[PDB]
Design a protein around this nucleic acid. Sequence first.
DNA 1: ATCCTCTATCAC
DNA 2: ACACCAAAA
DNA 3: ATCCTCTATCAC
DNA 4: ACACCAAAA
DNA 5: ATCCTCTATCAC
DNA 6: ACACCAAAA
DNA 7: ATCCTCTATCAC
DNA 8: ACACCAAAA
DNA 9: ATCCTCTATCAC
DNA 10: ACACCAAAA
Lengths: 98, 549, 49, 549, 48, 49, 49
Amino acid sequence: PERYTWDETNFGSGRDTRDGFIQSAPLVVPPPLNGILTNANPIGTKNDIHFSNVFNSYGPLTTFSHPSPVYPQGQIWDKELDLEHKPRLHITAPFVCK
Amino acid sequence: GVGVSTGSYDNQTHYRFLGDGWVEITALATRLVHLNMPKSENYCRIRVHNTTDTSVKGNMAKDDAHEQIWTPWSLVDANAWGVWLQPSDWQYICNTMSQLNLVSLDQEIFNVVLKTVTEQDSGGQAIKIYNNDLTACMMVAVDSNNILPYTPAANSMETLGFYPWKPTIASPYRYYFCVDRDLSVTYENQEGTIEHNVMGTPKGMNSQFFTIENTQQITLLRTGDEFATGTYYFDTNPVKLTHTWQTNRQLGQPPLLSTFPEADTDAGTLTAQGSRHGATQMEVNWVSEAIRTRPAQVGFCQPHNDFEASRAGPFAAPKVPADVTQGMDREANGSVRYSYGKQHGENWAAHGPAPERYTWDETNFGSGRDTRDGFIQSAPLVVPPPLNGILTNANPIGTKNDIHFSNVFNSYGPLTTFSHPSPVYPQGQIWDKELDLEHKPRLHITAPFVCKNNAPGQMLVRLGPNLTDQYDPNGATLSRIVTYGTFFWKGKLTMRAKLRANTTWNPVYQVSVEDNGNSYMSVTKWLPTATGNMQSVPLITRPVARNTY
Amino acid sequence: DFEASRAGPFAAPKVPADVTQGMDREANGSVRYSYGKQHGENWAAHGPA
Amino acid sequence: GVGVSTGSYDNQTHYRFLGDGWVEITALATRLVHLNMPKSENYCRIRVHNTTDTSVKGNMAKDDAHEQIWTPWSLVDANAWGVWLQPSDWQYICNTMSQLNLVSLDQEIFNVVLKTVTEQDSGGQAIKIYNNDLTACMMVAVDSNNILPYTPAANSMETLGFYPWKPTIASPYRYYFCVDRDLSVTYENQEGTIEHNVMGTPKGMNSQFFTIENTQQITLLRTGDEFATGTYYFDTNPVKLTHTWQTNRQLGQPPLLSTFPEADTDAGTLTAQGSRHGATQMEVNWVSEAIRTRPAQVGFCQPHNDFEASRAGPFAAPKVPADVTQGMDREANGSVRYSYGKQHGENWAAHGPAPERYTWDETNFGSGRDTRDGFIQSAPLVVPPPLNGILTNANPIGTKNDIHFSNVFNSYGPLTTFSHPSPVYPQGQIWDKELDLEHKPRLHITAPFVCKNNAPGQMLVRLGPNLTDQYDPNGATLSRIVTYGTFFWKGKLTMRAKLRANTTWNPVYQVSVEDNGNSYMSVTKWLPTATGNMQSVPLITRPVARNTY
Amino acid sequence: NTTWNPVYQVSVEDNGNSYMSVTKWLPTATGNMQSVPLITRPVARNTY
Amino acid sequence: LSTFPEADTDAGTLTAQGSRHGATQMEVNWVSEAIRTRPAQVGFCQPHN
Amino acid sequence: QTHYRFLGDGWVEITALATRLVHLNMPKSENYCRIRVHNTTDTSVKGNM
DNA sequence: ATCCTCTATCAC
DNA sequence: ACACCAAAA
DNA sequence: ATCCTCTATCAC
DNA sequence: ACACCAAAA
DNA sequence: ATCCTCTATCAC
DNA sequence: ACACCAAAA
DNA sequence: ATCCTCTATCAC
DNA sequence: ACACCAAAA
DNA sequence: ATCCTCTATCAC
DNA sequence: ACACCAAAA
Ligand SMILES: [Ca+2]
Ligand SMILES: [Ca+2]
Ligand SMILES: [Ca+2]
Ligand SMILES: [Ca+2]
Ligand SMILES: [Ca+2]
Ligand SMILES: [Ca+2]
Ligand SMILES: [Ca+2]
């Protein structure tokens, strides 16, 4: 089968794991060592597993953009989960019936 | 056709009282603005790279990389409490009301003054002669449709004077352009190099260049002309004027007493934790205020100094302000630090360029978090936890000594409910536009009022190019008669509040002043000096206790 | 997730859910009630228990 | 009576959408114009002879001989796309519409500024003082009846600024007069002399001398005055916004296939040319796409560098633009070369007087001609032609090595059908007057729109003679107070277009931009510099494929 | 249209090695063709 | 801006981070695009696999 | 076909027309089958899940 | 306040 | 946009 | 375009 | 000139 | 004379 | 303050 | 149930 | 056969 | 005789 | 069950 990867175009919303870092306490001009966790330091003793793979930035002030539709192959509309508490959207498709 | 004023000075504030204790506050702002020729005759796409700082290993959190577009136009922002109300008033409103809300805004420009300067007396010394040109003109325009990007002046303490009897000037219009900056991570000295600290060039897909002239209707103003706004109506949500306290530990039914105090000293007791009724979501066969079930989660844990980065570069993540707690964890519960300066506070007689600063600690108690005491137990709950049976604010993550679960833990979720921040009196921003993102943010920390629909068009101004007898278009760079001007600006801001109701018993915290002391609230602070200098210190908004359940 | 504020410490509430084969109770917020004779109990149950 | 603006700045563009996808585009142009005293106080009948160049043997094609009449008046031409629309817009229109047409024009002058300069400070150094005279006036007039000869400014890149935030000035009014110049033919060095390179004197029968003052109604404008045009209605033919391709070889019924391809590689075959049905106008008993009969002739052969001459002197014959073809035969299919300069493109930071140039290759394919392959066979057609049985682009005419049948062959005729040229975005001319010749030309290469009836009267302007205390009419030549001025010009241009329909399958060529590259279409080109410099590069008009049969 | 500077448009390109090459949305000699996903939202927005 | 470019090459400069006006939610006595206050958070960090 | 109906204020009413020839043969199972699917062949590996 | 060289799209 | 050039624009 | 510390001799 | 001070100015 | 990127709170 | 953004504000 | 590349001789 | 191609067919 | 901290689901 | 919280419930 032929395959195609779709890279979303909502820039300014993306994230570059490499440069993402958490400093500490009381902010310091140039951080020590044990004063900043980076995408190098390993979590739970695994070499390649970093804070990224477990960090969730989401929250109140977290605002973003609805994905886009993909021309051929893409899905158009979709039903909504019958869950008393719904999801802010489906990645499955663009249009979700209210 | 000239020699007759075109407007009228009025910097008053009216409290119109209506029934059921509703109130119609009316803000009157009049101000004298000065303005001189924009150095660049055109639009400049300028870049800014601080290699001088980005090059250091630890330094990144000091990154100022970006590329703005400099417009020869100047903005007229009044979006800052400090511009409308009088110290005392803010007192009054806060000490007396229960809620406040934006209603409508009305702006007005008039009494245009245009002058040119001629540096003469070359036959004697070096003097300067002042005189006004009548034909000369000014230019105004309003981006009502908001085609241009939003540029809040408080976003830089560059709004207008908070002092009426003293003039003021305008911040020049400048806006961001698309680049795609990149910077690597490093610490104190480490080893190797900063692998790559790049900037970048304009991308076809996101290049956006506007021009006041191709977007708005510009109006010419000579001396006798005058300009006036429409009347914008705010479509916003009101802001409570009361702080809260209650935390998950104090929500509803206090446990039942079995032991009653004897004297005003000793306390009382409850029933056996083992043999006590109630509910919990832990397996233990007992009960404690700590583990008892509550309606929802008040406040939540936020990640400390979460510098994240995108094609733009790195930046600190914003975060919902909250009480600092005994833990004095500021950066931990998003307090904010302002750096205002002499048109917005400062003393006045303060020497040097050193700006005055103020950190604001939010008053929504019961919502704060004390990092120290925060801890995660394990599995199957155990009375007193082992060691490898509880992670604390001591244990280090990813091999770093000072980095703990706090700096990466995010408590947020469905049951996580909190309170909208409060406004800061002088220096504070009032309203703000909303991000055009199909999925919005539950609020902005940037300001109190966020417009549900479209928002106040920004008011742009610029002097008109006063030409000389010599002019060649193809000519390198050329002369223009020196010129500058002034004009008054008048604003109208209407608000709606209601009087608070008294129901307690025990009096309650009120914003007050104090005799000549070393007290934060000391009259003298809001008083003139012998030479006439004064400062404006932020004031408490929401002096009175609320209730949340 | 015992968190704490000016009030003191306390366990964070959490949306109940199925426990799963994993029998992870405290993990998917099941709730434990401790009612007593006007609200259940047998009746002939002895002691304050 | 002064100190109050008389008009309003607005350089916007509105797209009014109506049903059936029709559209009403509205162009708004506002511009600041500067103007100084006309050196000649009168009308000058001046002559121009470039003997310095005409004298050489090969040189003639460089002849600039003529005699113009210099009027102390200045023209205000806005007839140039670049003045109305914004880069992006032209994109939009072209990428989205299917046709465009002129509708109406409206001009307006206002906010007059008149100043005099007094060079003083002779008691110190050498300064210049600026100040405005109120009583002073400006003069405007409109040759609505078009008594004066037409003088399109694009006919010289001297129209108005294409950049709004930057001022501009006017081209002075000048027009041709009757002489009867004559020049002989010569090459590289030859022998003998240039037999006679004469100019000549005014002829009684064709002498035509006009004067703004005896032809128009001049209106005086002081500072508080203002002037405004009527509202001209264009009576013109629309311009398609699509290029074509099909050539005589692809018109209608493709021959019948007898052999069908096996794989995406190999091709298919037709039927025996001998044993194939169809029609031709050659005697041969076979058939081939080359000789088959077509509806008519698409495009035609034009004579190369056909310098012809009349009582005026020599000049190159104009010629209907067309595709250049693989043959890259520019001068052969009339592409055009423009030499614009900084108010009309140029970069800006380009050094020296060197003007920037651009050659425009027409996009009406299937209409072009490749000189190389063009050939004439003989009599009675022969399968493979002899030698003296076919004249090619190798064989020389009249004993000159490089002069072939092409340079003298004219393919034009009844069955010769073609396409109207296209407009060029910046720098291009919009409309034009028609020659008052009882027998007209099927179009002008000069511009897209030619007025069927009368046309837009030219707008003339001139400053008024500011006299001194000293004046003698019989006096040789005399003083007048230095003076110069400015004013804004506002134009309104309305157009009508319709949206294109999508019917293909396969997407189609669209005008787009590209990331920071070495690409012709690179955002950066239409962007400001750090000091604020920018250029305007011509853009493709008719990006989309049409159909002609 | 409000910018100045033109803007990204979805277009095709001559017979190349370009992602956007007419030929992709064209039939073969035996009549074969593919459908390649296309860009939705070629044009720059604004969010603030 | 406090420093204006000379030629289409070199860039411009800002004011002293220490001596610059604005607001931030970090304790430092300076200012930088990186730490400055913004309206809200655009995009967010998601857990990998 | 596909029609672009143009209305004022630049609103547009697009109309999609789809016609297609469908083929269909007898459903092998005459009934409803509750079938199961386990890929032990892959689930058994250590890394694979 | 533009209509084909006047006034005068005067020829409406 | 009448108002299309020489009449009945 | 003056009314008792606002708007508002608003309390007429 | 009501219009007077705390209501019904 | 401010309404969500035009004109046009035009959608009243 | 309609006029809440994509329709029938 | 043919009208100038859609619907729509829709522009009657 | 209006219904003539870019408007008011 | 329950309506979001008063009177007052008073805002109907 | 208006009566949805800050206006015109
Ligand atoms: Ca609008
Ligand atoms: Ca005439
Ligand atoms: Ca006239
Ligand atoms: Ca008064
Ligand atoms: Ca408007
Ligand atoms: Ca049909
Ligand atoms: Ca009650």
